[PDB]
Amino acid sequence: DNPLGLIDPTTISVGTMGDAKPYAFTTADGNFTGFDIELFLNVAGRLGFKKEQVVFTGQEFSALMPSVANGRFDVAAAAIGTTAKRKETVDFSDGYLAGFLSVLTSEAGITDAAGLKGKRLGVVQGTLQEIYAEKNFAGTDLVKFPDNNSAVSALNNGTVDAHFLDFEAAKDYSARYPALKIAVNIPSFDAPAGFVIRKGNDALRNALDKGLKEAMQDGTWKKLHEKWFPGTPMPAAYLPK
């Protein structure tokens, strides 16, 4: 049978993204990796699904939740912030990561949120960054990008003054392009990352939640967090109790 309500009962089809390093990304061989991928794989194993039974498809961020809602994938995993607005379209698992939205700029760029008034700020279409900047960065010219790589290329070229993306990805790009630096950190603890599932696949949602709680309780979450986000604080909520 099919208790988890999957497209194929023998395989879990996961929608993800290739350029949200270190949450979710492709290595040079094309394989999907990163914290969110390794955490999902660990949770999927607890559900009785081996690595070979989980298939990852890379999509632009804006395509992920409509793809799950339209039955193209069973799950979506790509640091997808849990919000009321997104809960109208899709269901979410319990939160597994809460952190900052970050403004990445050039070596002689912006210093604070005030510095963004009248500047060109890059954003990935469909992200929480795009909503935040529309509500809190009025006067900043928002330049929409399909993904992080194109936005960083524009930032490196001087097309845009800054780029608004997730903290760990901003941190990763500042390591890959040493001239880049994080100028502003905005709290996004009210929107923790959750695995996205079809409205309302209660079986898969409850199964994902159980696997997540287990991975946090046995220190698996802690181990992956230490591996992918070195130096980032881990709250007691996601650590063993």
Ligand X SMILES: NC(=O)CC[C@H](NC[C@H](O)[C@@H](O)[C@H](O)[C@H](O)CO)C(=O)O
Residues that bind ligand X (CB under 6 A): 17, 20, 61, 78-81, 97-100, 124, 127-128, 166-167, 188, 191-193
Partners of 122 in the β-ladder? 143, 163
* Distance, CA of 17 to CA of 207 (rounded, Å): 23
CB of 2 to ligand X, least distance (A): 29
Q: Which is nearer to ligand X, 23 or 49 (CB)?
A: 23
Q: Give the contacts of 124 (CB within 8 A, at least 6 positions apart).
A: 60, 61, 62, 130, 144, 145, 146, 147, 148, 151, 165
CB of 50 to ligand X, least distance (A): 26
Burial (Cβ within 10 Å: 0-12, 13-18, ≥19) of residue 203:
middle
Q: Which is nearer to ligand X, 61 or 228 (CB)?
A: 61
Is the separation of the CB atoms in 59 and 15 below 8 Å?
yes
CB of 65 to ligand X, least distance (A): 10
CB of 126 to ligand X, least distance (A): 7
State the virtual CA torsion across 94, 96, 98, 102 in degrees, nearest 10.
Answer: -120
Using CA atoms, how far residue 24 sits from 10, 157, 167, 179, 196, in Å, is 23, 25, 13, 24, 14
Q: Which is nearer to ligand X, 6 or 14 (CB)?
A: 14
CB of 75 to ligand X, least distance (A): 14
Q: Which is nearer to ligand X, 98 or 203 (CB)?
A: 98
Q: Which is nearer to ligand X, 6 or 155 (CB)?
A: 155
